[PDB]
């Protein structure tokens, strides 16, 4: 079989920026990859389409996925409110890594972050489940609107998203 | 610091 590829079309204050495609490691973390895949197609009746990146810290990461509160306090998985840390086989080795945000052990919901640098201090605490396949330049463009405290100067949204393969 | 949490963002 093949690992699924999903995409996000990013917009800045409603102006289309571009498309970022991610490869999800379903062969290493099937449950975590499936969650992100289903939230991208919106097939369970809820998902990432229309949500925003509420926290961007230049040189660190872009965080998003809170489609219920749009502020870091919400979101939910396709398995109920939260699910377990599947495994920590993969590490935060550099720019482009896709990983799950959480609030402690076994609290995965829908929030995730895209690393713009190697973040080894998160290894073993956040489940890495994918990587940017194309469009890393769009993620770099996104960083420009972030700040040291995380607040963005423009509203960065996922205008559309779905599965390519 | 540099953490990625959901709810109580820490230093």
The residue count of chain A comes to: 165
The chain B residue lying nearest A76, using CA atoms, is B6
Distance CA A85, CA A106 (A): 5
Distance CA A76, CA A39 (A): 10
The pair of three-digit structure tokens given for residue A85, joined into one six-digit string:
């840390």
Active-site pick, A55, A92, A112, A145 = A55
Query: Taking a C-beta distance cutoff of 8 angstroms, is the pair A157, A121 a contact?
Result: no
**Contact with chain B for residue A60, Cβ under 8 A:** yes
Q: Could you give all domains of chain A from N- to C-terminal order, each with its CATH number?
A: 1-165 (2.40.100.10)
Q: Name the experiment that determined this structure.
A: X-ray
Distance CA B5, CA A72 (A): 8
The experimental resolution of this structure, in angstroms, equals: 1.9
Do B6 and A75 count as a contact with CB atoms less than 8 A apart?
yes
**Contact with chain B for residue A63, Cβ under 8 A:** yes
Query: Taking a C-beta distance cutoff of 8 angstroms, is the pair A112, A63 a contact?
Result: yes
Give the H/E segment covering residue A96. Answer: none
Active-site pick, A7, A25, A83, A113 = A113
Q: How many CA atoms lie within 13 A of A42 on its CB side?
A: 14
Spell out where chain A has E strands: 5-12, 15-24, 55-57, 61-64, 97-100, 112-115, 128-134, 156-163
A16-51 burial, b at 16+ Cβ within 10 Å, e below that, comes to ebbbbebbbbbebbebbbbbbbbbbebeeeebbbeb
Contacts of A126 in chain B (CB under 8 A): 4
The pair of three-digit structure tokens given for residue A129, joined into one six-digit string:
């489940």
Q: Is A63 helix (H, G, I), strand (E, B) or coil?
A: strand
Give the H/E segment covering residue A33. Answer: helix A30-41
């Amino acid at each position: 079989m093949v690992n699924p590829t999903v995409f996000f079309d990013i917009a800045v204050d409603g102006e289309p920026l571009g498309r970022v495609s991610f490869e999800l490691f379903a062969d290493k973390v099937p449950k975590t990859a499936e969650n992100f895949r289903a939230l991208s197609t919106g097939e369970k009746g809820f998902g990432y389409k229309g949500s925003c990146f509420h926290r961007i810290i230049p040189g660190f990461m872009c965080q998003g996925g809170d489609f219920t509160r749009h502020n870091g306090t919400g979101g939910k998985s396709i398995y109920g409110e939260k699910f377990e840390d599947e495994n920590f086989i993969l590490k935060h080795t550099g720019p482009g890594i896709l990983s799950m945000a959480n609030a402690g052990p076994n609290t995965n919901g829908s929030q995730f972050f895209i690393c713009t640098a190697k973040t080894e201090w998160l290894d073993g605490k956040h489940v890495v489940f994918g990587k940017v396949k194309e469009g890393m330049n769009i993620v770099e463009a996104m960083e420009r609107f972030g700040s040291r405290n995380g607040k963005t100067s423009k509203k960065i949204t996922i205008a559309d998203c779905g599965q390519l393969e | 610091x540099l953490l990625v949490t959901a709810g109580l963002v820490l230093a």
